[PDB]
Amino acid sequence: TAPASTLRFVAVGDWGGVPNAPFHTAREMANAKEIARTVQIMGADFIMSLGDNFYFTGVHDANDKRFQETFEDVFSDRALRNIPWYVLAGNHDHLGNVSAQIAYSKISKRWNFPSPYYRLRFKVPRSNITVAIFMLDTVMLCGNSVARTQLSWLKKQLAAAKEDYVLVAGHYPIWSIAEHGPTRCLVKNLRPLLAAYGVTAYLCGHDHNLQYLQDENGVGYVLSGAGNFMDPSVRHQRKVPNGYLRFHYGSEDSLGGFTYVEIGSKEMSITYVEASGKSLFKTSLPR
Numbered sequence: 001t002a003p004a005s006t007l008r009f010v011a012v013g014d015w016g017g018v019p020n021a022p023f024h025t026a027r028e029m030a031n032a033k034e035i036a037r038t039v040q041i042m043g044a045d046f047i048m049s050l051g052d053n054f055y056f057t058g059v060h061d062a063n064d065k066r067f068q069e070t071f072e073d074v075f076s077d078r079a080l081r082n083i084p085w086y087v088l089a090g091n092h093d094h095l096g097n098v099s100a101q102i103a104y105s106k107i108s109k110r111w112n113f114p115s116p117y118y119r120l121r122f123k124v125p126r127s128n129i130t131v132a133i134f135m136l137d138t139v140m141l142c143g144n145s146v147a148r149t150q151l152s153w154l155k156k157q158l159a160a161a162k163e164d165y166v167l168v169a170g171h172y173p174i175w176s177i178a179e180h181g182p183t184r185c186l187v188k189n190l191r192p193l194l195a196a197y198g199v200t201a202y203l204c205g206h207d208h209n210l211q212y213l214q215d216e217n218g219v220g221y222v223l224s225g226a227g228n229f230m231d232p233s234v235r236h237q238r239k240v241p242n243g244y245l246r247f248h249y250g251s252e253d254s255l256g257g258f259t260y261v262e263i264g265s266k267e268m269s270i271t272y273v274e275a276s277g278k279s280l281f282k283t284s285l286p287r
């Protein structure tokens, strides 16, 4: 809660330790506690989950699955007690009933998940400056480890969007040096569409760690999927064209970590916050 005239929001990915008991890991809990404090101090408009919402197989019963609850219970703290959530389909969520998590947005007011992929539209308290967010379904758009109209949808969308800012998120990485690494189909089908229509940046998770990349076009690459797991791998450093990596954190001994974004009249900022509370990397992107 701060009188800042900017669009703010936390962006986590890959949280949720189910199956088994409980539904959390030391780390999810840690991030839950920090994402709660971070928003008490800075304040947050919403929260977007970048994927892998219920870790091994995401949800049986459409809405009724009991895991939809232990998430509600993990992110239980008066601070987040009323903060909107915009969800995304991860790969593990596609091993379960996805339509389930979509419909779940009818049982929970804070849980928002209209379609596997959809368009969000916000506005900075400084009026004129409006932002467009395109939530996509990467499993449906790719396959590496059923949406040829999704890729065709994003085309028209991005080509028709007139907002001042345009962000795009999905679960699979375009660029990433970690364990999974760049995803061939995204690098081929999506990447060209960002610089093409001037997308400010691409947020994603999937690789259990924290990293910020940036191509020679100024399009930024925010990879913040470390809310439950932490992977120290960089097997794909070589697969990322030198100069793109600007920041990376995936140490073994560290609990979670996530990102905080603040878009204002002039620029969009991305500060990376470790579970602990320390801001370990920040950078901003032009309008």
Ligand SMILES: *[C@@H]1O[C@H](CO)[C@@H](O)[C@H](O)[C@H]1NC(C)=O
Binding pocket: 060, 061, 062, 063, 097, 098, 099, 100, 103
């Ligand atoms: C998936 O979720 C939908 C949405 O409520 C539900 O109607 C359906 O029973 C579920 N489908 C399967 C195959 O479990």
Ligand SMILES: [Fe+3]
Binding pocket: 051, 052, 090, 091, 092, 171, 205, 206, 207
């Ligand atoms: Fe994943």
Ligand SMILES: [Fe+3]
Binding pocket: 014, 052, 206, 207, 208
């Ligand atoms: Fe994951």
